[model samples]
Target chain A: HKCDITLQEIIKTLNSLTEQKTLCTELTVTDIFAASKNTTEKETFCRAATVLRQFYSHHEKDTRCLGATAQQFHRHKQLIRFLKRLDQNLWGLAGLNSCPVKEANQSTLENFLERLKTIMREKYSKCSS
Target chain B: HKCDITLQEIIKTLNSLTEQKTLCTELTVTDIFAASKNTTEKETFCRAATVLRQFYSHHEKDTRCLGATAQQFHRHKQLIRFLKRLDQNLWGLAGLNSCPVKEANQSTLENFLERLKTIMREKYSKCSS
Candidate 1:
């Protein structure tokens, strides 16, 4: 029952994120840290992060060779890193009234994006070839 | 923007379906048809159908061999058929005050379920082996 409830809440929060909401583009780790100041926004972000984590776990269960390209694999790893950091940072700040890891691991999110961009470029080149 | 809004609504409807709600078991094709009588329920079902159809299309874009077993492939086919029939049945009744195709293609849903169960059994046997 707890999992079901958690899944439902996650879905609701994810749905609430408007289509205009861009991940890691307009949505920096700093933004999430800043938003933690407000109780309502923090809860929404936390729920969304939880949902993403669950989805990651679900896919990890199946070990099917989907003929994924090297670029795809690289991107998947990058995504996991992003989700893990985001989830950890948000949950870690639950006890505090402000951002605890504001300056801590400041470049982790940026590093993820850089790697993602590289993978995307590789995928594009492979397609053009 | 239109597609994004559609996706959001579809996600919302799917998330609204409680975990206790079993598809084709507790939830029958007739239930969806009857729910069309109410504006709210019909809208919810229609949105969900749209989301599922989009997800199906998303997967269809990739032509990679995922090493999916025979049973997995069969189940995937069954799921698509189920979604298509469900979508068609609901959308077809949009203008009517009652179920027009109530008796039309009445057994289509049942056949989907039967195929699904057989596939599930096959998957179970393969797993045990």
Candidate 2:
């Protein structure tokens, strides 16, 4: 049977979440997943989603290497490079046909973050459960 | 008067420092510079050298992304990207003719690290002083 959720979809949803002005400020991914009905599904999703959140939160629209301080630029590069490596693993896990290095742009990352919260909250009953 | 030390030399020295298997551990860059006779030169070199230590300590020969955990791979990528960004700043500080990215490699990074310890210890009296 096909998996209920594709990794790509989850990633896309998460990117959307970062674009919104106000975040849930609700339960975190691990916290919500721990309380979910399904242990295995929630666990996998939780780990992936939590890592994504840690990564994309710092990525602003105008953020780039050109104008940042030495430390800031180093951090930006680290985050982007980490995402690229993570994408490789994600594609393999999802059995994706093609794996692209630079999969998530600013909007894409933002949306993915947004979608994760919704999935955890509305679908998985993350906060209100 | 022109500064006696160039940023490029410090970076080169630092890369050399990481090459040796046995580190001084006699004193960290900050410790040595702090105890030095001249506060200003030691201060600048100390800050730069300390950061270099933090960066190059992980760069070992045959270290690449091929066979590492997700986190390990991510860290390796982060370090390389950070170095590229750091090279830009180093070039600016040195007032060099051209700025080239990817300035340090395995052997080069190793040599720079070794050189840093020597500069701090022998030249700047990092350990002895």
Candidate 3:
């Protein structure tokens, strides 16, 4: 597949999914707090968002290496937008956004997005229910 | 994007979605039957599958036209596999899968999958909670 066109196409789809309002948006603090981990834990929406944002920001810089040309960083720039949108939307939905993300790894670009998609999908699943 | 490579690449992601045993798989008949439509309406998993299958089967053959040549049908053939897997899993989950699908439009290829993905995302959300 041609990287230029294919990558943009993938980002376009990702953007749509990330931007959509779904079950996760409907979740209440009570609902999430009750359902996740220990019920007594103080898991506010801001806290969760902060953690996710920090995690992504930590590893997001490496995507430039995937492409060989000068434009490689620019190509994944929407991914930056995607991450920002996802981070903002978490708080947007929560009324919404602040826990610090405390994880890191030297991961590939494809895997990062895949992991991001899976996390959102799972969050969407549980919250909507 | 080369249609050949892009089409298959899209299907690989789709197949992953269709096959994953997410929250939807955990839903009980009572859960779906209660949450959807009017409570008076009787919606078995089988009936729902029947509708979705019919809608998809009605249009599954047209994906070939998205390309200009002979292998176009084969290119979309995993779509056939995806549809079958989806239908089977509906029943597989329900114990899962009937309903007569009675909708159609001369929709394009990408739109069809987009529609399918949205439906599952919604389903997964409500079911998981």
Candidate 4:
């Protein structure tokens, strides 16, 4: 039961991350990566997508193994992409739940973005799903 | 409880993957992939390890990152090698668990390989431990 409880806390954290927030939701894959964190908000938080951008940061780190395999490492990138898309979709649901009349521009979307981000932080850090 | 069960189920999936399924268990750095999948059942399923094999299964797809960075996409390679060595050490425990049959021969061995994979999967996927 303790393991179960620890597991649940972990699950909740993961669940929190899976939820969509306004900024992350409206985010196109490109937008999620391009924006600045303070200036950028969601992009920095979701920097996993950045690794898939060009050469890997660990290219030299990997070369040391000489014979290291690619599949070993890149699977997580695939997993991250899947999570990002889900984040976008779920945020869409949230946006619909709290839609404003004429569609507020980026500047007016604070409540939704803040709520979503708070949840994401809880999930990724604690649960790491 | 139901949620816990679901989470466990997912952890199992991840664990099954994280474990060193043999053929995979005996796999040296090169032997794991150099062999065929049947030549390498452990390699096939543990193919998660293979994503890091070479140029990457999704290398072309990554090019869109005209401005992407190297950190995000490559973090997991770090994690996989971490797991692989853990698998080896754990299997050493298994070999010790069954050591006697002439300290075990590759051709005659079965118990150690099977046991290690079984536990690794249960823990990694079910608990992702």
Top of the candidates by DockQ: 3
User: Could you give candidate 3's per-residue lDDT for residues B28-119 as a string of tens digits?
Assistant: 22112111111111233455456446645765555422345546554445445665665665555444333443222123334334434533
Error of 1 at A97 (Å): 15
How good is model 2 by TM-score?
A: 0.22
DockQ, computed on Cα atoms, for candidate 4: 0.01
Tens digit per residue, CA lDDT, model 1, B19-55: 1122222223322221111233334334334433444
Off by over 4 Å in 2: A1-129, B1-63, B98-108, B120-129
Most lDDT-accurate candidate = 3
DockQ for each candidate?
A: 0.01, 0.01, 0.03, 0.01
DockQ value for model 1: 0.01
Better of 1 and 4 by TM-score: 1
lDDT of 1: 0.34
Greater TM-score among 2 and 4 belongs to 2
TM-score of each candidate structure, all chains considered together:
0.23, 0.22, 0.30, 0.16
lDDT (Cα atoms) of all candidates against the true structure: 0.34, 0.36, 0.39, 0.30
lDDT of 3 by residue, A1-129 (tens): 112232233344555545543222222221121111111112333544564465457545654223455465544455456656655655554453334322221233343343345433333343334
lDDT of 4 by residue, B18-115 (tens): 54232222332221211100121232333323322222233323333212344533433433444454334433322322211111112111232232
Q: Is candidate 2 or candidate 3 better by TM-score?
A: 3
